[PDB]
C-alpha cells in the first residue's frame, strides 16, 4: 500500500481556461484545473517552459488536482521583446495578484480557493522564472508557502544565464522561506541528435539549483527519463524531440512526478508529512527509478 | 523502413477549424495534418459517445505522422434517443465540406488527395461510420476504406442503436471498401458491477468483423480496454467508466496507430508490407494482438 500519491487522485477534476473574455479578465490566459467536488482547496501555480503550451502539461495537472489541489498555469507570451525572463516574472505576479478576485469567480460551483495556501512551480525556464519570483526580485500581493522545481534550467551556461542569473554557485544561498522541491530528469544532461544542444545544460542544471537550496529543501531525480518526457503524450513532437527522450512510459514518470508533487504540497500547503517521507525512505514505490534522492533540513 | 508502431518522419500540426473559419465547417472539426506540403491522403475519425475528439490527439498524431491528413468531427449531444442518424448525417456533411473547406485550413501548401479518403470511428462512433459506409447516406467524395476502433453497435442484441446495421449473418455487409476491425479483449468485461461492459457481447468486435466481407481483417488488443487508447490527459472522470488495462496506455495508442497506419497504407498504396508482416507475426506489435484473422479474397 504505502502511498497512493503516485496513484490517481479520487477527487474528479475539471479543465478551465480563461480567454481574457471572463470578468475579472486575467492579466494573461491561464489554464485552471480544480476539483469539481465542493470544499475549500489549496492553490498552486505552474510556469510553462519556453516554446511550450500549458496544454502540454494536462496530465500532470489533472492527477495533481485529482488528489486534491487547485492548479493555475498561465500561458506566457513568446516574450520575444522582453529580455531574459523579467516579463514572465511580472506576468506571474500579475496572475498571482489576479487570483484573489478572479479564481473564486471562475472556480467551479462549490469550489473555494484557500489562497492563504499558495505554492509556485516551473518547468525548465519556467522554473527559473518561478524561483526568481520566489527570490522576491519582483513583487506579489499574496505570499507563497512552497516552491516546486520541474527540472529547472538557468541558461546556456554560467557565463550566459537568463535575466537574472539567480544562481550564486554558493551552497545553500537561497534566502527563501517556502520549503522547496526540485525534481530532476537524469538524461536532461545527456545530449541527443547532436545539432540540438543539451536542454538541461550543467551548471544551470537542476542540480546547482537544489544545491543552492536552503534546508528545508527536497531533491528527487527521474534517472531513466528526459527533460520533456513529463510533457503530455500528445505533445507536438516537433516541439519535444529536441531534448533526449527516455526509453520508458512517459505516462509512468508523469504519474511519478505527480506523486512526488502531491506529497511535497501535502507536506506544505497540506498537513500530511508522511507520503513524501515514505517515498524518501523507499523510493522504489515510485513507478520510475528515482536516483539520486537526498533531503536537507 | 518497417518503422510502423513508431512515429512517422512527417512533423504534424493540430488545427481546430471552428464554425468561425471559412468555409465554415458544417460541424466543429479537429484536423491534424503533416506540417510539410505534398500529396497527403485524407481520413475521417468519428469519436465515441460522450467523448471529445481532443481525447484522440495522440493516436491522431501518430497516424498523421505517417503522412495522413486526418479529420476529427466533434459530434454533439444527440436529441434523438436511440438514434445515430444525427451523427451519421453530420459525418456525411463533413465529407462534402472536405473538398472546398480542407485546403483552406490545411498548412499553406499542404494539399489533400481526396480521391483516397478513409473513415474510422470508436464505439458508437464505429457504428456511425460503418453505417455511412454501408451507404445509409451518400457523400459526393467516395471513401475507399473502413476502420472500426472497437465498434459498439448498441446496448444488446435486442437493443441495437438504430440503424441496426448488425444482421448476425456473415459477410452481410454490402460495402466494397476494405474493412479493419480493431477490438479490445477487455471491452466485454463489466466493471464496478454498476458499470455494464462498454463493448457488450453479441454487439462487439466478435460479430462486427463476422458481418464484414472480404477484404476483411480482425485484430484484438487482449491487453487493453475500450477507452485505453484515448490520450493520457483524458478527463478520467469519463475514461474510468470502461475497464482499464494495466499495461502502458501509450503502448496501445501506438499499437492501434500502427495497425491503422498500415491498413491505410495497404488499401491506399497496396504496399501490403507492414500489414502483411503484422498479420504474419503479430509479435512485432508492442502489445498482444489476439486473436488476429484476415479474409482476403485471394
Ligand atoms: Ca491533449
By the 10 Å C-beta count (0-12 exposed, 13-18 middle, 19+ buried), B297 is classed as exposed
Could A236 and B58 be called an inter-chain contact, meaning their C-beta atoms sit closer than 8 Å? Answer: no
Q: Which of A13, A66, A232 sits opposite B232 (nearest CB)?
A: A232
Q: How was this structure determined?
A: X-ray
Could A233 and B58 be called an inter-chain contact, meaning their C-beta atoms sit closer than 8 Å? Answer: yes
Size of interface A-B (CB pairs under 8 A): 53
Distance CA A125, CA A50 (A): 6
A33: left (phi over 0), alpha (psi -120 to 50) or beta: beta
Contacts of B233 in chain A (CB under 8 A): 58-59, 62, 232-234
Residues 6+ apart with CB under 8 A from A262: A5, A9, A63, A64, A67, A68, A69, A275
**Total residue length of chain A:** 297
Could A66 and B236 be called an inter-chain contact, meaning their C-beta atoms sit closer than 8 Å? Answer: yes
Q: Which of A54, A60, A65, A233 to mutate to test the interface with B (most CBs of B within 10 A)?
A: A233
- Establish if B5 belongs to a structural domain: no
Distance CA A96, CA A119 (A): 10
Distance CA A197, CA A189 (A): 10
Nearest C-alpha neighbor of B183 from the set B221, B213, B211? B221
**Total residue length of chain B:** 298
- Whether the Cβ atoms of residue A148 and residue A121 lie closer than 8 Å to each other: yes
Distance CA A243, CA A123 (A): 13
Q: Can B226 be counted among the known catalytic residues? A: yes
By the 10 Å C-beta count (0-12 exposed, 13-18 middle, 19+ buried), B226 is classed as buried
Chain centre distance of CA A175? 20
**How many other CB atoms are there within 10 angstroms of residue B137's CB atom?**
16
Cα separations (Å) of A88 from A81, B8, B290?
11, 35, 51
Q: Can B127 be counted among the known catalytic residues? A: no
Contacts of B57 in chain A (CB under 8 A): 234
- Establish if B1 belongs to a structural domain: no
**How many other CB atoms are there within 10 angstroms of residue B86's CB atom?**
15
Chain centre distance of CA A67? 16
Which residue of the set A55, A67, A206, A227 is catalytic? Answer: A227
Question: Grid cell 468485461 — which residue?
Answer: B189
Distance CA B241, CA B198 (A): 8
The resolution, in Å, is: 4.5
By the 10 Å C-beta count (0-12 exposed, 13-18 middle, 19+ buried), B50 is classed as exposed
- Establish if A178 belongs to a structural domain: yes
- Whether the Cβ atoms of residue B295 and residue B261 lie closer than 8 Å to each other: no
Q: Which of A13, A236, A251 sits opposite B249 (nearest CB)?
A: A251
Distance CA A267, CA A273 (A): 4
Distance CA B226, CA B188 (A): 9
- Structurally, chain A folds into a number of domains equal to 1
- Whether the Cβ atoms of residue B214 and residue B159 lie closer than 8 Å to each other: no
Using alpha carbons only, what angle is made at residue B39 by residues A238 and B62, rounded to the nearest 5 degrees? 35
CA distance B132 to chain A (A): 29
What are φ and ψ of residue B155, in 5° steps?
A: -70, -50
**How many other CB atoms are there within 10 angstroms of residue B31's CB atom?**
25
All cell numbers assigned to B289: 494482438
- Whether the Cβ atoms of residue B187 and residue B227 lie closer than 8 Å to each other: no
Which residue of the set B62, B87, B123, B127 is catalytic? Answer: B123
Nearest C-alpha neighbor of B226 from the set B203, B197, B201? B197
Nearest C-alpha neighbor of B7 from the set B47, B54, B91, B67? B67
Distance CA B213, CA B178 (A): 8
Nearest C-alpha neighbor of A217 from the set A169, A157, A280, A167? A280
End-to-end Cα separation, chain B, in angstroms = 26
Find residue B147's DSSP bridge partners: B120, B180
Give the residue on A whose Cα is nearest the Cα of B253.
A233
- CATH code at position B21: 3.40.50.1820
Nearest C-alpha neighbor of A259 from the set A2, A7, A41, A61? A7
- Establish if B3 belongs to a structural domain: no
CA of A232 to the centre of ligand 1 (A): 7
- Whether the Cβ atoms of residue B45 and residue B121 lie closer than 8 Å to each other: yes
b/e string for B180-217 if b means 16 or more Cβ within 10 A? bbbbbbbbbeebeeeeebbbbeebbbbbbbbbbbebbb
Distance CA A26, CA A93 (A): 12
Residues 6+ apart with CB under 8 A from A187: A224, A225, A226, A227, A244, A245, A246
Distance CA A288, CA B149 (A): 31
Q: Can B115 be counted among the known catalytic residues? A: no
Cα separations (Å) of B88 from B45, B138, B139?
12, 10, 11
Find residue A122's DSSP bridge partners: A47, A149
All cell numbers assigned to A165: 542569473
**How many other CB atoms are there within 10 angstroms of residue B237's CB atom?**
14
Question: Grid cell 520549503 — which residue?
Answer: A179
- Establish if A3 belongs to a structural domain: no
Contacts of B12 in chain A (CB under 8 A): 236-238
Distance CA B266, CA B260 (A): 10
Could B14 and A237 be called an inter-chain contact, meaning their C-beta atoms sit closer than 8 Å? Answer: no
Contacts of B253 in chain A (CB under 8 A): 233
Distance CA B257, CA B116 (A): 18
Distance CA A182, CA A153 (A): 11
Contacts of B14 in chain A (CB under 8 A): 236
Distance CA B150, CA B203 (A): 10
Three-state helix/strand/coil letters over chain B = CCCCCCCCCCCEEEECCCCCCCCCCCCCEEEEEECCCEEEEEEEEECCCCCCHHHHHHHHHHHHHCCCEEEEECCCCCCCCCECHHHHHHHHHHHHHHHHHHHHHCCCCEEEEEEEEEEEEEEHHHHHHHHHHHHHCCCCCCCCCEEEEEECCEEECCEECECCCCCCCCCCCCCCCCEEEEEECCCCCCECCCECCCCCCCCCHHHHHHHCCCCEEEEEECCCCCCCCCCCCCCCCCHHHCCCCCCCHHHHHHHHHHHHHHHHHHHHHCCCCHHHHHHHCHHHCCCCEEEEEEECCC
Distance CA A197, CA A178 (A): 33
Please, what is the angle between helix B249-269 and helix A250-266, to 10°? 150
Using alpha carbons only, what angle is made at residue B107 by residues B106 and B110, rounded to the nearest 5 degrees? 75
CA of A60 to the centre of ligand 1 (A): 11
End-to-end Cα separation, chain A, in angstroms = 27
Contacts of B65 in chain A (CB under 8 A): 237
Q: Which of B232, B249, B255 to mutate to test the interface with A (most CBs of A within 10 A)?
A: B232
Contacts of B248 in chain A (CB under 8 A): 249, 251-252
CA distance B259 to chain A (A): 19
- Whether the Cβ atoms of residue A154 and residue A85 lie closer than 8 Å to each other: no
Sheet strand arrangement including B216-221:
B12-15, B29-34, B69-73, B38-46, B110-123, B146-151, B179-184, B216-221, B289-295
- Whether the Cβ atoms of residue B45 and residue B19 lie closer than 8 Å to each other: no
Could B233 and A8 be called an inter-chain contact, meaning their C-beta atoms sit closer than 8 Å? Answer: no
Max Cα–Cα distance, chain A, nearest Å: 51
B171: left (phi over 0), alpha (psi -120 to 50) or beta: left
- Establish if B2 belongs to a structural domain: no
A226: left (phi over 0), alpha (psi -120 to 50) or beta: beta
Which residue of the set B150, B223, B228, B274 is catalytic? Answer: B150
- Establish if B270 belongs to a structural domain: yes
Cis-peptide into B76, omega within 30 deg: no
Could B11 and A249 be called an inter-chain contact, meaning their C-beta atoms sit closer than 8 Å? Answer: no
The dihedral through the CA atoms of B237, B242, B244, B249 has a sign that is: negative
Sort strands A217-222 and A290-296 into parallel, antiparallel or unpaired: antiparallel
Sort strands A111-124 and A147-152 into parallel, antiparallel or unpaired: parallel
CA of B234 to the centre of ligand 1 (A): 7
Please, what is the angle between helix B249-269 and helix B57-65, to 10°? 40
Cα separations (Å) of A42 from A35, A64, A117, A133, A271?
10, 11, 5, 20, 11
Three-state helix/strand/coil letters over chain A = CCCCCCCCCCCCEEEEEECCCCCCCCCCCEEEEEECCCEEEEEEEEECCCCCCHHHHHHHHHHHHHCCCEEEEECCCCCCCCCCCHHHHHHHHHHHHHHHHHHHHHCCCCEEEEEEEEEEEEEEHHHHHHHHHHCCCCCCCCCCCCEEEEEECCEEECCEECCCCCCCCCCCCCCCCCCEEEEEEHHHCCCCCCCCCCCCCCCCCHHHHHHHCCCCEEEEEECCCCCCCCCCCCCCHHHHCCCCCCCCCHHHHHHHHHHHHHHHHHCCCCCCCCHHHHHHHCHHHCCCCEEEEEEEC
Report the C-alpha dihedral over residues B134, B137, B138, B144, rounded to 10 degrees.
-30
All cell numbers assigned to A94: 500579475
Which residue of the set A88, A151, A229, A232 is catalytic? Answer: A151
CA of B57 to the centre of ligand 1 (A): 6
All cell numbers assigned to A77: 507570451
Distance CA A234, CA B58 (A): 5
Half-sphere exposure of A233 (CA within 13 A, CB side): 30
- Whether the Cβ atoms of residue B72 and residue B33 lie closer than 8 Å to each other: no
Could A12 and B232 be called an inter-chain contact, meaning their C-beta atoms sit closer than 8 Å? Answer: no
- Establish if A181 belongs to a structural domain: yes
Domain that holds residue A74: 13-296
By the 10 Å C-beta count (0-12 exposed, 13-18 middle, 19+ buried), B169 is classed as exposed
CA distance B245 to chain A (A): 14
Amino acid at each position: 500500500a504505502f502511498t497512493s500519491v503516485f496513484q490517481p487522485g479520487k477527487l474528479a477534476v475539471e479543465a478551465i481556461q480563461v480567454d481574457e473574455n471572463a470578468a475579472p479578465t486575467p492579466p494573461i490566459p491561464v489554464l485552471i484545473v480544480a476539483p469539481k467536488d465542493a470544499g475549500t482547496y489549496p492553490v498552486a501555480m505552474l510556469l510553462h517552459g519556453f516554446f511550450l503550451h500549458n496544454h502540454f502539461y494536462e496530465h500532470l495537472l489533472r492527477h495533481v488536482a485529482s488528489h486534491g489541489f487547485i492548479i493555475v498555469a498561465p500561458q506566457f507570451s513568446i516574450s520575444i521583446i522582453p529580455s531574459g525572463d523579467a516579463e514572465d516574472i511580472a506576468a506571474a505576479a500579475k496572475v498571482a495578484d489576479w487570483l484573489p478576485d478572479g479564481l473564486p469567480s471562475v472556480l467551479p460551483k462549490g469550489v473555494e480557493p484557500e489562497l492563504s495556501k499558495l505554492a509556485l512551480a516551473g518547468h525548465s525556464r519556467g522554473g527559473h522564472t518561478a524561483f526568481s519570483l520566489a527570490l522576491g526580485h519582483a513583487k506579489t500581493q499574496l505570499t507563497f508557502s512552497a516552491l516546486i522545481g520541474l527540472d529547472p534550467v538557468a541558461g546556456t551556461g554560467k557565463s550566459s544565464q537568463l535575466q537574472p542569473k539567480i544562481l550564486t554557485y554558493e551552497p545553500s544561498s537561497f534566502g527563501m522561506a517556502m520549503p522547496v522541491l526540485v525534481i530532476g530528469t537524469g538524461l536532461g544532461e545527456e545530449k541527443k541528435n547532436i545539432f540540438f544542444p543539451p536542454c538541461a545544460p550543467k551548471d544551470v542544471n537542476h542540480a546547482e539549483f537544489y544545491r543552492e537550496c536552503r534546508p528545508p529543501c527536497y531533491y528527487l531525480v527521474t534517472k531513466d527519463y528526459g527533460h520533456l518526457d513529463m510533457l503530455d503524450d500528445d505533445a507536438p513532437k516537433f516541439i519535444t524531440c529536441v531534448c533526449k527522450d527516455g526509453n520508458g512510459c512517459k505516462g509512468k514518470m508523469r504519474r511519478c512526478v505527480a506523486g512526488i508533487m502531491v506529497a511535497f504540497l501535502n507536506a506544505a500547503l497540506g498537513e500530511k508529512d508522511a507520503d513524501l517521507e515514505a517515498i524518501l525512505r523507499d523510493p522504489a514505490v515510485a513507478p520510475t527509478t528515482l536516483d539520486p534522492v537526498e533531503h536537507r533540513v
